[PDB]
Each structure stands twice: as structure tokens, then as C-alpha cells.
Amino acid sequence: EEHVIIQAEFYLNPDQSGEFMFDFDGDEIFHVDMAKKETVWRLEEFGRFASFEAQGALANIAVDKANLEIMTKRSNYTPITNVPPEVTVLTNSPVELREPNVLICFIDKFTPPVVNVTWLRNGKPVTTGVSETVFLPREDHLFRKFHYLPFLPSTEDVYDCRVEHWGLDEPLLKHWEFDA
Amino acid sequence: EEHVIIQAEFYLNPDQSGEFMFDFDGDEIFHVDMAKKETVWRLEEFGRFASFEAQGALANIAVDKANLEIMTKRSNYTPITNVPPEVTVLTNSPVELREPNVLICFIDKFTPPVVNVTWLRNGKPVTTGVSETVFLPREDHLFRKFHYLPFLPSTEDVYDCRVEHWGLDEPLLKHWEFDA
Amino acid sequence: EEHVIIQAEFYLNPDQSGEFMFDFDGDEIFHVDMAKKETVWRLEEFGRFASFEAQGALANIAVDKANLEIMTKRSNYTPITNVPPEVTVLTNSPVELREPNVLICFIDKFTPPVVNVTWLRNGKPVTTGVSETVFLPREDHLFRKFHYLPFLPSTEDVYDCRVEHWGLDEPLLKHWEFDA
Amino acid sequence: TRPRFLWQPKRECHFFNGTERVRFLDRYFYNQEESVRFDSDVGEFRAVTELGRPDAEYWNSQKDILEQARAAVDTYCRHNYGVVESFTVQRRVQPKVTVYPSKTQPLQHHNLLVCSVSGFYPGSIEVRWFLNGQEEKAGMVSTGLIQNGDWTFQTLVMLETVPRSGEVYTCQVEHPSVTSPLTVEWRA
Amino acid sequence: TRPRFLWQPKRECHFFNGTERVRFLDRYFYNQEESVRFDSDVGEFRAVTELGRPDAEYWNSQKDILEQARAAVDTYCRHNYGVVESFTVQRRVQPKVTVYPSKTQPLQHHNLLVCSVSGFYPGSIEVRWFLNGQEEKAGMVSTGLIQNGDWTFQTLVMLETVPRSGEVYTCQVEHPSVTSPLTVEWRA
Amino acid sequence: TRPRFLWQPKRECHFFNGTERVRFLDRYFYNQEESVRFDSDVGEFRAVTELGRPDAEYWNSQKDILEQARAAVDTYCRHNYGVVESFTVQRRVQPKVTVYPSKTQPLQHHNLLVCSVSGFYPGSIEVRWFLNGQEEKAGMVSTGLIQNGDWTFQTLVMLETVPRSGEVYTCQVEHPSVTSPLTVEWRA
Amino acid sequence: LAGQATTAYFLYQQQGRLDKLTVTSQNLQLENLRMKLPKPPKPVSKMRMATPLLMQ
Amino acid sequence: LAGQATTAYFLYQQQGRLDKLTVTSQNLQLENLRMKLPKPPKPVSKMRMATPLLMQ
Amino acid sequence: LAGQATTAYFLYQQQGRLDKLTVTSQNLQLENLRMKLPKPPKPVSKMRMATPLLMQ
């Protein structure tokens, strides 16, 4: 019955991107969206059970940004080995023809936590009803990221998860198709 | 065609809890949630018909808190007779098997307006999709409170409304079951 | 492939009403609601594609209000010819019996952009589930406005769009009925 | 379980026949007991209990407070009436009516009739039963207007009878929302 | 019914063939009449009506304002084009097409054909009718592109004919969103 | 493609058997490498790599920082455990189980059995197969707990067999959420 | 001989359920249109709140 | 003799209505998944607003 | 002779689809009631956030 509670407060430079979350055995309790300044609970049922002050998290990210600038000067501007993001395309439940599912693109084992993920249905971009989870941490400190595409399964459509990461010379193109 | 418009602005100590509402023949026009600082209309159709400035209500509750502190010193710290909350479990419409209904737990004739209401389905707590109305007033100044549990009726499940009030030595456990 | 991007920032006096929008070939990219201080995108899919700072728009409307006051003193208080709002009642899709449609009341070619539009189902006002778009511009600078009433079509109900504009001596009453 | 302290103002607005006569009852109740009862009918600032006597004196000491309370009869109550009339006073939602049999005791056959008037507003319902077109009496045992809190009411008027597949068992409902009395019939 | 005053700026951005040539027409219209018409094609600050003449002079007096307006041809129009291209310029939604008969006069049998092209973007539709595989003419009486306001258009092109269960009554639609002309047929 | 810099703190809270023993591992990791590893088990402020050595010294220089970190073992981890217990530690969602055949190679008949345990929490599943009521072995080739990110897990344990319409092909699941082992059967 | 009864037995219940099912579907689809509505703005009507004072 | 016609009469309309009803249900259930989505954030794309000046 | 088979063929699939369709409709209608709920407030439980310091 051992459990771990973690707090991820990463900030990248130069990208002007930072996040905040609470990690409970890998899963995410919530995440403070900097843009909306809101405590976005991973499950809304948690908001009816607990609470959090979002403005406090933004103070940390400002401090995290400051430390990174301090570390950058002290580290003589050393770069980061851009690990290739091993990508696996899965579904939340066994794909059921014409039964809504959430394709899950597992952008795994990568750094820095800034990636370009685009869902391609029949080769064309999909930007309507497509969600993504905040960059989730791992034991060896390589980020995870899930992209959710609520879709009505069909054999006519072939989905893709284009994953553009600086560690990849060529863009990754993982594929999914209805076969069950 | 006589009608009454009331304004309830109660604040309790020690509980750090206060509310605000407009009473129209017992029903609630709206209520200013202190946490969200929003004019939460009881029916959203009223927001498309009227408006209210939520920040003004919070000023009153601060004044209401101040007066209660003033009255507490003047009243030589006299307590409140904790009236037992007579509880009746009802449904918004005649229970229809497998047809969504909102169980209504009528926490009636109680003070102070701080109660612990938990819905128990088959003896286990339910904290997913469970709503409650702000503490509503009465003619003799004993609060009302409705708890809403949108449920799909089933004979397999037996619901409960555990009502923990300081006036009750033992917790109240009212019961509901599908019988129509 | 010629396209036009416009920016409408009108403010009326005496009405204390001003708006903001981006016009792309007549359609509306988004509009900054002064009351909510939010960048309300016409399609929410645009919010997942672009962004806008709503507070900046409110600064313009304050400047637009100031200029109108400056122009009013310089124009010796000249009024506006209140053009009659030609009204056409249409549907978003061919009316399908018992199949949800959005009646569209086209308040067209009118000024000033303050009108009283009310949907009358069987002669009674409808104020539940009735939407309106911000006052949209035209080439000759006469505003457009669409009113949306998501309705389940029925021959029993006859809808109306009462359009009260100062240019009209008598109220306009356009009519719709299911005939397909 | 510690001693508590409660301060709930109740600013009541009583207007009769629209706004022909408006009564502004300003109640400040402390621990389910009143302190001051500023009323427009009286006009003068009063106090009900001995605890609220100092409170009334301070508020009537300043003439500005008196004017604010006295002007509240038309600024607060009357203006709000027009604002809230459109969806509360004029609110006429349909009184959905269902009639079903019921048993007075467990393990016994049905011997009661409940005329369920659920989901209406405002609360001025009337229930009257009929048998074969003839009104029945001695069955006006009503459970009262049970408020649902969602701006709706609920009432279960019960009349005792034994079904025999020989009568019509007609209930009736008279509400402002419907110009014609809403009927309902039930046969075994 | 009091005199009104309206101040609606219209900052137009005209770019042709993507962003090969960008025209920035800055219109400040007062009471449905223009005041200034700062244009990138002209570049110089002008004024249309006599009322807006002082307005133009003040704005061209400061060289900073001129630079801001002149730099707006690529900072405002051109940059926004790239930002808004993905979902407005490249927006290609399917032109749902339905064809149904209609009557020109009440109480008369159907004598019209309406090729309903509802729910598309952008507005560059084309409609052409056919009979038994042969194109029909003299039926291009269109109602025009009726904007639905929800980023969609609507058009009802009408061609007059009398159904006889002997023809196919084929309409056609040509839109950028579909690489192949969308056909539709209707037989009585 | 420019050089990057990443600063991700990892404030870990390890408690065993509820809150009997709480371990507060404070990790500040820079570019996938640790800088300081303030731990409650050690208590003393340490540093893993040579880069984080100055960071640890500054933070242990102030006694207030030490007290804040040392008090965090019960103020941060222990208090949060009670707050987050109700919906994370006690969270027991049902392990939906489906069993379907599959083919190891394309264009070949089905020769695999996948016991799909999708949609459960927490991740302590157990899978064991059966044939005609007799447990089968040598089929524990599991794909591992694939996290779905929506506070749910997923696992596809595969056992190789050839259907012959003679066996029952029973899989089993043992999870804290269900007091009784969840069974599932599949016959061709 | 029993086929007529069985078919009507299936026919009756499928028809009755589906009629109410179509209505609750179309009305549900109508709720989606209402939920997709642009959230009409705050009108000019403003309910007024009284300002309580302190108890000295 | 008429049973064949009556059964097909019930069979045809129930099948036609239900096919469209299943699609509008699955798509509705798909809208629920979309409405349950975590509301993707604000991208880096920022439309620019011009700043009008006063009329002196 | 084939009418019995054809009717049951229609009867079986219409019944099976509709049973799951009714459940996904009632549960969907139940989601509407949940979405119409008054959005229960923030409880007294407050998860605590640690305050990181600067690297000198």
C-alpha cells in the first residue's frame, strides 16, 4: 500500500513554457493552467472532493524560471540531450466499431517537454475535439504525454500521431486502424 | 397575488461560513458563491433575464461577520439551541424505473446552517454528481436545504441521506427505495 | 482568393453599448464581451487554434466612447437616420419536422445597432434557450444581427421575431411556420 | 461541538396586488430570534426583543438611515418587482399530473388514490375528485405543498377508494398556468 | 426615441493571392458616413467627407502615427493572415445539398425545384441542373448567398419544371471543399 | 533547434502502510540529472551530482529552511494523504474485463487469447487462465500496466492456444476494487 | 399459429419504446444545440441589493 | 394473409428509424466525450488588435 | 414458410440494439441532469503546495 506524491514544476528556456501538477503513482491529481489561472482537476470529481489555490502555483513557476536562469549562467549554457520520444498509439478501451473511444498517443521518454503532436485523419490535420494532458513525469525524469481524440471508430479513416521533437531528425508517424 | 422578496445573509462563528441569496416565496432567485465570486442563478434562464453584482454581496457578508462578532461580545457568548433537522427523502418526480430522477433530501427545521449530508448508495458514500442548494430560509427562521442526486432508479440500490447535525446525538439515516 | 479582415468597435450614445469583433468576409472570428471580459470565439474550435487578449479590446471601446463624445460636440449633436431593419426569418438547415433547427432572424440594414428582438412562440415570449450574435457589419455600414432559437419543429407552434427599432413606427412581426 | 453564533438578516418585501401597496419588513434575526423589525407600515424604527433595542436606537439616531429604509419601500421592493416579475411573478410552468393507486398498508392490495401534481409554479393548486362524472368528497387528505427547491412544487392529495373496474376515478387540477382545469382519469 | 451618435471604426485588410499584395484600408465611419480612409495603396492620410478632414490632418501631423499605419500593412494584415489562415482561409466544410420540389403558388401542385446548398464555407458555390444527363438552362434564378452567421452560407437556386416521372432532375455543386463536383438527383 | 534548459523539481512523498512511516524525498532535477536530494530518511541536506553541491550548501546554511523541509514530512506528505485519500488511495474503480481471440501473424487464423483488463485503479491486477476448470500455465506473457492517463490502467495478458470448441478458456482477475475474483469465459 | 401473437408481441413493445426513445433523442439533440448556443449576454435589468450597516 | 404485409410494415419503419437513431446516439455519446475533454489550452498563435487613437 | 425466419431475424437485431440503445439514452439523459446540477462548491479540504526557494 505504498504510495508516492510528487510535484512537477518544470520550466523551459527558450520556450517560455512552464507547468504544475501533483503526481500520485504516475497519474495526475490536477494541473494549474497558467493561461486560465485555474486549478484544472484531471477528474472534475476531485474538485467536489478537494481544492487548491492556483495563484500559489504561478508564484512557484516564476521562481522556477528564475532558478533556471540562475542555473543557466552557472552551467555555462550546456544543452539537453533531446531523447527521442518513443510513441505508442493505443485506445482507452478495446476499439468498438461506431462506438466512441479516446485514441491515446503515448509520447513517452522525451525531453525537453515541448512537442508538436497533431492527429491526422486520412492524412489531414484534426483540430476539433482533440485534447492533451500536461507533461507527466517519470521515475527517470523523462516526460510522458497523452493526446486524446474522442472518435467514432471507422475502417474508412486511418489516424496518425505526428510527433515533432528536436531529438528526431525526421518526424515520427505512428498509425492506428480499426482491427478487432 | 401577494408575494414576498427576502434577502438571507447569514454568517456563522466559529465556522467561517456565510452565504447570500434572494428568496421569492421560499424559492431561491440566485445565490452569490463566495468561493467563485459568481452570481450563481438557481435557474440559468434567470441570468438571461436579470443580472446581479456578486462583489457587492461579499461586502455584506463581511459586514455580517463583523456584526456577529459585535453581537457575540454584547451577548456574553450565548450559544444556539441546535434544533434537530427533520429529514424527508423525496423525488422531484414520481420515481420512474431506469428513468433519471433527482432524489431530494429535505434537511428541514435546523440551526446552525452547517450540516454534513452524504448520499449512501448500498451503504457506500457517493461523491460523483451530487448537488446541494444553499441554506434556504423559513418563516420561523429555521433553514432548509435540498440535496440533489441525479440517479437512474434501480431496486438493487438503496439510497440514504446521512445528516450529521450537532442537535442530533446520533446520526440520522433516512432511507429511500424504488416502490411505485 | 481575395479576403478581407475588418475590426468593428462601435459605441452608441445615449445607450452605453459598445462591442468588438473581427470580420472575415462578413463572418465573425470572435467578439470580446464587455460584461464577461472574455474572448468569446464564434466557434470554440477557433479558441483551440488562436488566442486574443480581451482586456485590450475594452481599452479601445473606452477610446471609441471618448471619440464619439468628441465627435458629438464637433458635430453639433446631429442625429442618425434610423434605417428600417429589413427582417427575414430563415432556418440554418431545411426545416425537418421534430428535428432540431436554429431559426435565424436576419435583422438586416439597420442603425443604430440597438434593437429589441423577441421570439414569440404561439404569441408568447420565449426567453429560454434563445441566442443572438453581436451586431455584424456590412459594406455600406448597416449592421446585421442573427437571432438563434434552437427549436424542435412543429406545426402546432408558430414562431415570430418582433423587431422593435426606432426607425419603425410600428413593430415588425415576421412569421415562420413549418412547410416543407 | 462548540457554542455557535448566527446572524441572518431577513429583508422582506411584501407587496399586495402587484405594487398597489408595498410593505417593507426589515428583519435582522439573531439565533432564530429577532433584533430589529424595521417595517414600512409602521415606518418608525422598532425592536422586538430586548437584545435588539440598542440596535434600533442607533439606526434611527441617524436621519439618513431612516430615509434609506423608508425609500427602500419603492427603490428596493417596487423596482425589484418589475425586474423579477418576468420570470417569477409571471412564471407559469405546466402542472404535470399523474394518478396512480397505492396501498395504505404493506402486503395489502391497493386502496388509495394519489393525484400527483408535481412540477408546477406558483403554488396555488386545487384538487377535486370525481366518480363516473360525479364529484366525490371526504378525500381531501393532502400532504401539503412539498417544495422541490428547483423553483417547483409537489403535492400528493390522497382519496381512499377501492378499485372495482366500475368507476372512472377522475381527478382535477386548477392552476394559473392553464386556462382550463387539467383533468386526469384512471381505471383499473 | 432620442437622437443617437454612432462611432464604428472599420479597419479593413485586403490581401490578394495570399499575401502577394496587401491593401490596408483603415475606415473610421461615423453615422454610416466615413471620416478618414487611411489606405495602404494611397499611403497618404486622406479624408472622404468634410467632417473627417480635421481628423486626417491630426493623424498625419505626427510621423509616428503614419509609420504605425504604414507598418500595419504587414504587421496587422499579413501576420493575422497566417494566424487565421488555418481555420478561415483553409476552412473547407462540406456543402450539404438537398433537392426538394416546391410550389410557386399556394394550393397548387409542385412546379419548382430548389437545389438547397446549406452549410458550407467559403462562399464560391456553383449550381447547374441536368435532365436525363443533359444540362438544362433558363433556371439560374438564385436567391443569393444567404449568410447563416454560424460561419456557414446558404443558397436556394430555383429552376422551374413540372415533374412527370420521366426525367432525373440532376443538380450539381462545385465547391473548393470537394475535389469532385457534388451531384444530386430527384425523381417523382 | 537551439540549446535548451530544463528545471523540473520533483517533491516526492513516500509513505508506507498509510502514514506509519513517511519518507519525504525532495528532488530538484536539472536536465534529467539531479541537483539536490533532500530526504527525510537521511534528514541532512545532501546533493547527488557535483553541480548541485552549491545548492545543498545554501539551503542547509539557513536553519529555517531545514526546519521547513523536516516539518514537511508530516505537514506536506501526511496532511495531503488524508486530503487525497478519499478519491485516490481509497479509489476502487471496477476492472472492466473482456477476452477476445487474436492472431499472432497477419493472414493467419486466431491463435492467441488476450485477457483485456482495461479501466481500473489502482494497478495491482492479477491474471490467471483456466481450461475446463483446470488452470493453465506458460501463458503469462503480459504487456505490462499501460497507463491511460485518465486515472485508469490497461493490461493485455496474452496466452497462446488454438481454439477447438472443446475448452472453456477461462481468465481471472483479482483487484482490490472487487472482493471476489472477476472471472471471464470464452468459447469458439 | 403462434407467430402472429409473437410478432405483435415484439412489434408492440419495440414501437412503444422507440417512439419515446426518438423524442428523448431529438430533445437531447436539441439540448446540444442549446448547449452550443453563444451564451446570451447580461441584460440591462439589474436586481438591487440592500446595504446592511453595522450594529454600532 | 395480411400478417406478412403488417410485419414488414412494422419491420421497415422500426429499422429505418433505429438506424438513424443509433447514429445520433453514438455521435451524441461522442459529444459527451468531447464535452468531458480537458479543454485544450491557449496556443502560441495570437491575433493582433490595432490601437485606435483619439480624434484630437 | 420463410416469413418466420425473416421476422425473427428482424426481431432479434432490433431488440438487441434497442436494449443497449435505451440504456445509453437514459444514462445520457442522466448526464444532462448531472450537467444541469448546480456545480457543488469548494469543500474545506485544501491540498498543500510546497514553496521552492531560489538557487541563491
Numbering used by the authors:
A (entry chain D), B (entry chain G), C (entry chain A): 3 to 182
D (entry chain H), E (entry chain B), F (entry chain E): 3 to 190
G (entry chain I), H (entry chain C), I (entry chain F): 61 to 116
From the reporting publication:
pmcThe major histocompatibility complex class II (MHC-II) molecules play a crucial role against pathogens and foreign antigens in adaptive immune responses by presenting peptide antigens to CD4+ T lymphocytes. The assembly and trafficking of MHC-II molecules are regulated processes involving invariant chain (Ii), which acts as a chaperone associated with MHC-II subunits during MHC-II biosynthesis and antigen processing. Previous studies have shown that Ii forms a homotrimer (Ii3), associating with MHC-II heterodimers to create a trimer of trimeric complex, Ii3:(αβ)3 (6, 7). CLIP lodges within the peptide-binding groove of MHC-II, acting as a “placeholder” to prevent premature peptide loading.
We determined the structures of HLA-DR/Ii and HLA-DQ/Ii trimers to a final resolution of 3.0 and 3.1 Å, respectively. Despite having similar resolution, the density map of HLA-DQ exhibits superior clarity. Within this map, the TM domain of both HLA-DQ alpha and beta chains is distinctly discernible. In contrast, the TM domain of HLA-DR is not resolved to the same extent. The overall HLAαβ/Ii structures are approximately 140 Å in height and 80 Å in the longest dimension of width. These assembled complexes adopt a C3 symmetric trimeric configuration. HLA-DR and HLA-DQ bind to the CLIP region in a way that closely mirrors findings from previous studies. Specifically, in our study, Lys102 and Lys106 on CLIP exhibit the potential for forming polar interactions with Glu55 in HLA-DRα, as well as interactions with Gln53 and Asp57 on HLA-DQ. The interaction between Ii (chain C) and its own HLA-DRα (chain A) extends beyond the previously observed engagement with CLIP and the groove. This expanded interaction involves a hydrogen bond between Lys80 on Ii and Glu101 on HLA-DRα.
